[PDB]
Write a protein that binds this ligand. Structure first.
Ligand code: ADP
Lengths: 62, 62
């Protein structure tokens, strides 16, 4: 509760590049980073794919 | 055509989904544990039916 995320948002605004935030807290499964091979029904891409898709840019502020 | 949502259409895991949801439906369930159960079911759909971690997930949701 010190505004670090708000600082990141303000930096993104000052850089004209989109903002996205990710939670790695206590995560142990790299799967969420790498998603899943897509072979299994229900397999999902890693959250980075979602971030890039929503931010609609290859130079976002992550 | 015979199926009409019978047999293969249950998948043997969405059946567990429906069972748990109906079991807790009569319950006035907390929203927090509601979303935790939703996450557990999402993982259930994200995991095969023939693995140990899936069995552990099923036991925890039980
Ligand atoms: N120096 C500051 N100037 C402006 N807003 C601040 C400041 N410090 C904290 N905030 C407020 O904190 C909120 C976000 O806090 P957050 O970034 O979630 O905390 P933390 O960085 O610890 O996770 C924002 O709404 C922001 O307005």
């Amino acid at each position: 509760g010190v505004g670090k995320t708000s600082i990141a948002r303000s930096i993104a605004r000052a850089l004209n590049r989109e903002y996205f935030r990710f939670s790695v807290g206590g995560m142990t499964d790299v799967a969420e980073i790498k998603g899943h091979r897509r072979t299994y029904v229900g397999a999902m891409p890693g959250k980075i794919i979602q971030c890039l898709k929503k931010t609609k840019t290859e130079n976002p502020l992550i | 055509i015979i199926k009409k949502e019978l047999g293969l259409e249950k998948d043997d895991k969405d059946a567990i989904e429906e069972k748990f949801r109906e079991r807790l439906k009569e319950l006035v369930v907390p929203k927090h544990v509601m979303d935790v159960v939703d996450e557990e079911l999402s993982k259930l759909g994200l995991l095969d039916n023939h693995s140990s971690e899936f069995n552990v997930t099923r036991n925890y949701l039980d």
